[PDB]
């Protein structure tokens, strides 16, 4: 859906209402999850002080996202280097305390709640306008315009056959993905196809530091640790 230049097509009529209805009740489900896990003496024993990471060790290990926020490091790309319109919504970053599994889990739940707040703000501040950049050389023209006008047809043909030529250069753009700082180093050459697209993956760095976390911890603690990273090997293996 999200594409260079905006979004593919506009939201179907009557979707904001459904999103509001769902987000109204999602708080109860979050509270139920908390009541299920937060204060349980079993969960609070398998995740408290299990997998502690130091602040400087976390920074040096290339960690990002929760594993920084979970260990006192006050960093979040949504606030420090805002992208899109993240400089408008108001939210709080759940800074962690101890750096263990329990602290990171609490951080994740609080991020869920803050994201619910951001969803409410986005629903209440939807502006009028179009969906893609008003440039038929980087965004395909509307299907109505394509079937009526010369330039729209030509641009649609060339965009869907050749594509938009990206100016030569290289960039590294990263965002606060729900896992961490997901980034891309995109290197173009002036043609219609990329020359080198390297993917910076928080999962890669987090799994690189798995051994440092699991020191003296038993196998069950390792089961907890490879879960506190939310490790996904689609992103890791690229």
């Amino acid at each position: 859906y999200i594409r260079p230049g905006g979004v593919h097509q506009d939201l179907p009529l009557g979707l904001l209402d459904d999103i509001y209805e769902f987000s109204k009740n999602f708080s109860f489900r979050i509270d139920e999850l908390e009541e299920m896990l937060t204060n349980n003496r079993i969960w609070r024993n398998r995740t408290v002080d299990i997998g502690v990471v130091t602040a400087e060790d976390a920074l040096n290990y290339g960690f990002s996202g929760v594993m920084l926020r979970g260990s006192g490091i006050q960093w979040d790309l949504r606030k420090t280097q805002p992208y899109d319109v993240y400089d408008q919504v108001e939210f709080d970053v759940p800074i962690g305390s101890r750096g263990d599994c329990y602290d990171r889990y609490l951080c994740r739940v609080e991020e869920m709640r803050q994201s619910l707040r951001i969803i409410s703000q986005c629903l209440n501040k939807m502006p009028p306008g179009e969906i893609k950049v008003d440039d038929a050389k980087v965004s395909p023209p509307k299907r109505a315009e394509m079937k009526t006008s010369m330039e729209s047809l030509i641009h649609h043909f060339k965009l869907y056959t050749e594509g938009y030529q990206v100016p030569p250069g290289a960039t590294y753009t990263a965002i606060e993905a729900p896992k961490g700082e997901f980034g891309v180093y995109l290197v173009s050459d002036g043609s219609s196809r990329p020359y080198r697209c390297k993917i910076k993956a928080p999962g890669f760095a987090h799994l690189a530091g798995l051994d440092k976390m699991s020191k003296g911890h038993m196998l069950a603690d390792v089961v907890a640790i490879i879960g506190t990273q939310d490790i996904v090997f689609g992103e890791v293996d690229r």
């Binding site: 995109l186 051994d211 699991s214």
Partner: protein, 60 residues
């Protein structure tokens, strides 16, 4: 004592196939990179391509 992770058990050559595809053609690759957070990957790629193209999406 030691825990060596042997990743690559799902290594699709994504960063190699991306070159052979155009920027629009490479968009679905990022959706298939992280399968639990999806629109964020497309958002990152779109921001990169927009920054390279020196264009900005509409406020909506």
């Amino acid at each position: 004592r030691k825990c060596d992770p042997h990743i690559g058990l799902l290594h699709r050559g994504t960063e190699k196939l991306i070159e052979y595809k155009t920027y629009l053609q490479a968009l679905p690759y990022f959706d298939r990179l992280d399968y639990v957070s999806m629109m964020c990957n497309e958002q990152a790629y779109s921001l990169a391509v927009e920054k390279l193209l020196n264009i900005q999406p509409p406020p909506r």
